[PDB]
């Protein structure tokens, strides 16, 4: 079908079809433009006219301009060939490395895994990260709220995860930048590169990059997450791996939703968001799960508005999170990295009924001690570290060892940390903390535990430390 | 023109608040749909498309740059209002000024705790 443009009002184009009318969600291609202009279908205004939202500037459009129904929604190059490449909302390359040549194309708008495809069980997804794995275990096909921003190892952590997923699960990763700052994108690009996760020379790239820059119109920043989603889905539905999905940042998704909504003239709901806030979110979130074929795990960067946890945006979002990973500037200040907060970070799966009594107990152990020490913290500084009991003095010692044992060297940061990375195993993780709690290493000194892998290294470090 | 030709240019937008208002006026008169604060659904886009134009080029392109100092006027310190929210979210940092500070004798009234520079030291000299 070949339709005409009947009206152009900002980012909302109306297109009339003489013969066949494109269903909602289809992707139309504007004829005669320097660059590709995709109009997504949004409504059937009646009278053979559709109401669409432009995926880029409608500058220059002319009533009467020709529009070609691509006879489908936005489809994109999916597959391995995507890995290490940067791609647009409509699956275009934006890295200047030539065409993304894949066999399959995958429409972005996809329904979610039927009930009968659902997994019936909770399984922790190991990352090899002591804090994460021990206190706030990720969950297969679950959603993680990643708090904290700059200065704190946000990118480095994002990069280790990627690495560790490729390593321990042979699973690839996708990176969706929803409302990315052009400056920051390019900076992420070269950062991944320098760390290997991306490889311009070979075919060893472990990440595919999807970008929806901040200049892009609401509709584009509205879809980019889906696009990235489509990509990840492939490594699950076609190759049954355990993909990783990063959405940065989940807030800009929602925001992009409201903008599109408003443009479509619908009445906003509470706090100005879209009346379809919950649906907009669910039709997306729900595609992120463990099906029988594999699983997609999503790391979502969250931005809470007005620091208001009950704001509709954030509130809605929590309905889908299985765990939070709180990056903390303070922690970073102790030199501790990853700068994850062992007391603020949480996981739904931290249930003995799920992680097993052992795992559950250790965790609950590490936390209490961490908590107790926190109490004493106030006393120590004021009244001086001495009314401390044979007991009060051990909780501290241990805690201090613990706090350190919770830190760790990332392989991603080897390039210029001059230190070898460590991918501690869940078994090793429980053991390690188990013993410290136990009192096995009370004789060991603090610094012994700083920046090491498995407890064994804590022991050797002590050696080298006389 | 400067940026592209190996040169360096600084730009001050004073204010982006007034511009938003100008845009809003037009939008509503054209009868487009109003959102929070009566702002059109593409007011964010209006600034993002503006503020992104500033950037540091590569030598391959001339090494020239365009730095931007956009001004936003808050109301009763409400950084979370609509337009302030966008722009804060778009830029690499903020220099937060306070009246309390100002009257207290701190001039310029920069609230050091709340101000930021994502770029940071990567822009500071070794001396500094």
């Amino acid at each position: 079908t070949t339709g005409r443009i009947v009206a152009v009002i900002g980012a909302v184009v109306d297109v009339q079809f003489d013969e066949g009318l494109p269903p909602i969600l289809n992707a139309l291609e504007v004829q005669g433009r320097e660059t590709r202009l995709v109009l997504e279908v949004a409504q059937h205004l009646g009278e053979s006219t559709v109401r669409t939202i432009a995926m880029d500037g409608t500058e220059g459009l002319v009533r009467g301009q020709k529009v070609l129904d691509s006879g489908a929604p936005i489809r994109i190059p999916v597959g391995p060939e995507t890995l290490g490449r940067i791609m647009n909302v409509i699956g275009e390359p934006i890295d200047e490395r030539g065409p993304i040549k894949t066999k399959q194309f995958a429409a972005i708008h996809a329904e979610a895994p039927e009930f009968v495809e659902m997994s019936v069980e909770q399984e922790i997804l190991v990352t090899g990260i002591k804090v994460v794995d021990l206190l706030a275990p990720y969950a297969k096909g679950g959603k993680i709220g990643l708090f904290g921003g700059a200065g704190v190892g946000k990118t480095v952590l994002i990069m280790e995860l990627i690495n560790n997923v490729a390593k321990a699960h042979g699973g690839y990763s996708v990176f969706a930048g929803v409302g990315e700052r052009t400056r920051e994108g390019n900076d992420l690009y070269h950062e991944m590169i320098e760390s290997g996760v991306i490889n311009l020379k070979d075919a060893t790239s472990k990440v595919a990059l999807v970008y929806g820059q901040m200049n892009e119109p609401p509709g584009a920043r509205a879809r980019v997450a889906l696009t990235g989603l489509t990509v990840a889905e492939y490594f699950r539905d076609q190759e049954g791996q355990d993909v990783l999905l990063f959405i940065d940042n989940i807030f800009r998704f929602t925001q992009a939703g409201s903008e599109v909504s408003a443009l479509l003239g619908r009445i906003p709901s509470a706090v100005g968001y879209q009346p379809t806030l919950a649906t907009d979110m669910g039709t997306m979130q729900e595609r992120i799960t463990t099906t029988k074929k594999g699983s997609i795990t999503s790391v979502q960067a969250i931005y809470v508005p007005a620091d208001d946890l009950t704001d509709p945006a954030p509130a809605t979002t929590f309905a889908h999170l299985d765990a939070t990973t709180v990056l903390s500037r303070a922690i970073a200040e102790l030199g501790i990295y990853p700068a994850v907060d062992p007391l603020d970070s949480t996981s739904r799966i931290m249930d003995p009924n799920i992680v097993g009594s052992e795992h559950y107990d250790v965790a609950r152990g590490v936390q209490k001690i961490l908590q107790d020490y926190k109490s004493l913290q106030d006393i120590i500084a004021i009244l001086g570290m001495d009314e401390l009991s044979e007991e009060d003095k051990l909780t501290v010692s241990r805690a201090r060892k613990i706090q350190r044992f919770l830190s760790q060297p990332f392989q991603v940061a080897e390039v210029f940390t001059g230190h070898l990375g460590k991918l501690v195993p869940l078994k090793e993780t429980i053991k390690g903390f188990q013993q410290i709690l136990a009192g096995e290493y009370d004789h060991l000194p603090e610094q012994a535990f700083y920046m090491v892998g498995p407890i064994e290294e804590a022991v050797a470090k002590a050696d080298k430390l006389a | 023109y400067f940026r592209d030709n190996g040169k360096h240019a600084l730009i001050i937008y004073d204010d982006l608040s007034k511009q938003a208002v100008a845009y809003r006026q037009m939008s509503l008169l054209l009868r487009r749909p109003p959102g929070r604060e009566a702002y059109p659904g593409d007011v964010f886009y209006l600034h993002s498309r503006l503020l992104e134009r500033a950037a540091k080029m590569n030598d391959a392109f001339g090494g020239g740059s365009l730095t931007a100092l956009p001004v936003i006027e808050t109301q009763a310190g409400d950084v979370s209002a609509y337009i302030p929210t966008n722009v804060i979210s778009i830029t690499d940092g903020q220099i937060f000024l306070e009246t309390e500070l100002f009257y207290k004798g701190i001039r310029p009234a920069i609230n050091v705790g709340l101000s930021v520079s994502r770029v940071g030291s990567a822009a500071q000299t070794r001396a500094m």
Partner: peptide, 15 residues
């Protein structure tokens, strides 16, 4: 209040 959003993710361990 007014400029709180410049803290940030402050009550995060509560979510």
């Amino acid at each position: 209040x007014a400029x709180a959003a410049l803290x940030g993710a402050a009550x995060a361990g509560l979510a």
